[PDB]
Amino acid sequence: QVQLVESGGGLVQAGGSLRLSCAVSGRTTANYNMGWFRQAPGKEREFVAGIKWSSGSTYVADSAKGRFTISRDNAKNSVYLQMDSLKPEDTALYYCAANYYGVSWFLISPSSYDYWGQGTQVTV
Amino acid sequence: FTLPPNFGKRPTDLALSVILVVMLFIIMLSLGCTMEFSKIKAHLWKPKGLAIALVAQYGIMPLTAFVLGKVFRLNNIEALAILICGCSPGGNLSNIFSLAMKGDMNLSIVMTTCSTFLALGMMPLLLYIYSRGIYDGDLKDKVPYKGIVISLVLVLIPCTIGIVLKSKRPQYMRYVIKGGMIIILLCSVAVTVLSAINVGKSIMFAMTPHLIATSSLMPFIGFLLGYVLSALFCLNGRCRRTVSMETGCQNVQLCSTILNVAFPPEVIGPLFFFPLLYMIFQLGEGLLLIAIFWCYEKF
Numbered sequence: 001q002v003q004l005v006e007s008g009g010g011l012v013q014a015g016g017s018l019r020l021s022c023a024v025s026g027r028t029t030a031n032y033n034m035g036w037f038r039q040a041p042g043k044e045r046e047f048v049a050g051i052k053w054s055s056g057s058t059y060v061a062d063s064a065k066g067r068f069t070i071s072r073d074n075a076k077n078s079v080y081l082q083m084d085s086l087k088p089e090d091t092a093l094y095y096c097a098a099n100y101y102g103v104s105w106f107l108i109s110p111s112s113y114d115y116w117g118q119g120t121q122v123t124v
Numbered sequence: 125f126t127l128p129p130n131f132g133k134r135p136t137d138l139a140l141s142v143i144l145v146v147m148l149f150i151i152m153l154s155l156g157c158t159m160e161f162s163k164i165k166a167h168l169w170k171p172k173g174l175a176i177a178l179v180a181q182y183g184i185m186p187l188t189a190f191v192l193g194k195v196f197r198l199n200n201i202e203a204l205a206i207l208i209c210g211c212s213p214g215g216n217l218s219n220i221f222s223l224a225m226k227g228d229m230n231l232s233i234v235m236t237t238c239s240t241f242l243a244l245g246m247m248p249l250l251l252y253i254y255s256r257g258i259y260d261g262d263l264k265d266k267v268p269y270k271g272i273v274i275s276l277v278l279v280l281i282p283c284t285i286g287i288v289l290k291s292k293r294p295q296y297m298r299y300v301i302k303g304g305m306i307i308i309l310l311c312s313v314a315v316t317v318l319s320a321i322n323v324g325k326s327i328m329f330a331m332t333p334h335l336i337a338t339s340s341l342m343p344f345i346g347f348l349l350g351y352v353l354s355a356l357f358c359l360n361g362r363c364r365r366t367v368s369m370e371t372g373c374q375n376v377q378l379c380s381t382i383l384n385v386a387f388p389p390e391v392i393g394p395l396f397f398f399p400l401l402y403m404i405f406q407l408g409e410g411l412l413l414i415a416i417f418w419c420y421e422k423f
Contacts, residue, residue: 029262
């Protein structure tokens with residue numbers, strides 16, 4: 001029953017460490033993962049990065065190695081994806097999503113996640 | 125490491141699903157191989173002793189999964205999977221163990237059959253009640269009630285096949301025993317090799333020592349609790365031991381099939397590998413306890 005909301009407006013060419021912040025409001029329980037996603041025009045949502053809110057273990061998809069990250073803001077109920085300065089390529093609508101499922105591995109599948117914020121649209 | 129399973133490849137998934145469904149068919153037909161309506165009427169006179177074993181195995185199995193999950197503070201989804209593991213008929217293998225050592229098979233088979241055709245009754249309610257207890261009941265909106273019932277009825281179809289076959293020519297079970305052995309051996313080896321090759325990295329995610337400890341203890345704990353309860357209710361030694369070991373071993377096939385069909389494969393992932401380790405461990409421990417009993421009666 002957790003409400004999500006996003007905050008990003010970086011629309012610039014390579015050289016911008018774009019501030020992305022996804023304020024989370026709800027039952028911030030244990031053992032729920034939370035991830036970030038993509039919508040380039042005409043291709044479906046796909047995984048990029050995530051982290052367990054409880055333990056703090058993070059994962060990075062192939063395109064984002066050395067290029068993205070994620071930071072927990074657990075006291076203030078926020079998540080912090082600082083994507084490093086990226087080439088003009090990655091222009092896409094991004095989302096937030098989280099599942100209460102708790103597991104050692106990183107859940108990656110599009111359809112699995114439930115809670116969706118009003119993901120920000122940003123170009124590069 | 126710490127990588128998600130290299131998923132997306134459907135044909136292997138479909139092979140898994142088809143072998144699991146066909147083993148479900150054949151095992152529930154093997155249930156249908158046993159004639160019980162004659163014993164149904166006779167045992168309806170004093171079923172209270174039988175009903176005690178039934179309610180005991182229905183109650184202990186969920187609460188045991190619950191308490192082992194709590195004591196190892198296991199993460200939510202695999203604790204839920206263990207809950208699914210505890211709740212299953214698991215009768216054919218138990219029947220095999222008892223026939224190997226001793227006992228009147230007539231009871232063991234009828235408890236197995238009634239456990240099956242009452243599982244669809246108690247299964248959903250026990251899931252509903254004990255889901256709330258994980259932390260607050262986070263899975264409440266992910267339990268596939270109707271889908272679980274669908275899985276159950278597809279399982280029950282071979283039961284109908286067997287029971288109507290009793291009405292018709294019972295001669296067909298003369299060849300039934302052979303085929304059954306060959307198909308169970310082939311399906312066992314096939315699931316082992318296929319569930320090994322299909323995902324390799326995730327097996328390490330599925331081999332956590334907590335899983336091993338639970339899959340070992342909880343069936344054994346079921347044996348112990350069946351033993352002590354049947355001792356409590358003044359039942360004879362043979363019935364006590366039969367109901368104990370009937371409780372101790374469950375239906376890996378039903379649990380695995382529910383896990384794959386009811387929940388997304390990435391959700392279950394290598395946790396689907398847990399019931400196989402379960403089943404092989406009850407095989408080993410049941411044989412060991414048979415040997416231990418034959419040692420005990422000696423001396």
